[PDB]
């Protein structure tokens with residue numbers, strides 16, 4: 186379990202906000218592996234997101250299945266995932282053992298920065314997830 | 319989708335050639351319900367991990383990633399390459415009703431993996447559709 | 451505060467029918483959207499998902515029941531807080547019931563959990579079938595020692611559905 190409130194909640198949100206600015210993504214979420222939205226932020230320029238609980242259960246079960254495939258093959262883990270459509274994409278990475286960072290971005294976002302700040306955001310959130318164990 | 323007879327023979331040759339041309343360990347065509355329609359292993363490779371398990375997981379993953387795409391207004395995302403330290407997986411659609419999967423290790427060149435996996439999938443898509 | 455509830459059981463036992471009846475009766479304001487990853491015959495392939503209010507949030511999941519989908523069924527059990535085991539009443543599905551309960555215990559043991567570790571409620575579903583088996587016979591197969599609440603149901607009609615959910619909710623709460 187991982188219950189996020191108080192100062193760690195506030196620090197997680199500040200990470201999500203900073204990541205949105207540095208990357209140009211539309212939505213940033215910290216979700217646990219169980220599928221629960223633990224913190225989310227939306228870029229104020231962006232349209233309303235799709236239902237975020239739908240997004241997060243789909244993303245957590247994608248990550249569940251791909252981690253199981255890895256373990257099937259003898260690996261601890263595959264790398265961060267970038268799902269890329271014609272306009273929309275998703276950057277999904279680990280925020281420690283119990284959670285995932287999710288970035289939703291469109292054509293306006295530079296992929297280099299998504300990956301680059303996405304990875305640092307993942308690492309900052311794993312640090313924060315530990316202080317809420 | 320059920321592959322038997324000549325379409326099945328045709329599928330297996332595409333699978334053998336892709337393994338030869340890529341250096342990959344195993345190659346499968348699975349349906350979107352996670353059933354293995356045809357597969358081949360490289361003679362040099364170890365016995366595979368359980369392939370029915372591998373296939374239910376890939377098809378579950380695909381249903382979830384396909385729902386993510388539609389959620390975002392996309393028809394679909396691109397083919398996947400999952401890379402561990404040594405092992406990897408390539409997955410790509412083979413028409414609307416099937417997925418090609420390659421499992422490979424660090425001796426298989428990623429550019430060949432990607433280049434022949436993509437051709438294998440289009441070839442298998444053709445076999446699949448003409449099987450109906 | 452977030453709880454996960456998994457509806458478990460053999461193929462076609464009525465797990466998805468449960469979440470759909472619940473979804474149809476819970477008012478707008480107290481539920482999110484239902485997600486289903488299902489084949490065209492609408493058998494569940496990966497999961498159903500239904501978030502609702504009863505702050506505290508309950509995330510309801512179902513698992514695919516086919517024996518050959520154990521790999522995705524077990525991903526869904528991760529982090530479960532409570533389980534509703536939906537048993538079918540049909541005479542020819544009794545051993546399927548036992549196989550599912552055995553499979554349930556096995557998957558739980560991979561996460562280091564015993565059946566004592568997780569609240570569980572047995573729902574004996576499809577009470578409307580003309581040839582339905584006695585409730586106690588179904589129960590004696592999936593729960594020989596009667597350690598678990600049992601509730602009867604006709605999920606296609608709503609009967610037992612909310613009472614099963616309140617029962618498992620009750621147990622998950624009393625567990626904290």
Ligand SMILES: Nc1nc2c(ncn2[C@@H]2O[C@H](COP(=O)(O)OP(=O)(O)O)[C@@H](O)[C@H]2O)c(=O)[nH]1
Pocket residue numbers: 460461462463464465466467468492493494512515575576577578579603604605606607
């Ligand atoms: N007669 C009867 N049929 C039911 C009942 N509950 C579900 N069904 C039917 O059983 C079939 C399988 O239901 P579903 O929830 O999809 O099964 P599952 O999701 O695999 O457990 C569907 O046709 C349902 O209408 C019930 O209580 N009585």
Ligand code: ALF
Pocket residue numbers: 460461462463465466492493494495513514515516
């Ligand atoms: F059709 Al099922 F679990 F057997 F959804």
Ligand SMILES: [Mg+2]
Pocket residue numbers: 357358359360
């Ligand atoms: Mg072989």
Ligand SMILES: [Mg+2]
Pocket residue numbers: 465466467492493494512513514
């Ligand atoms: Mg179902």
Ligand SMILES: [Mg+2]
Pocket residue numbers: 552
């Ligand atoms: Mg036994």
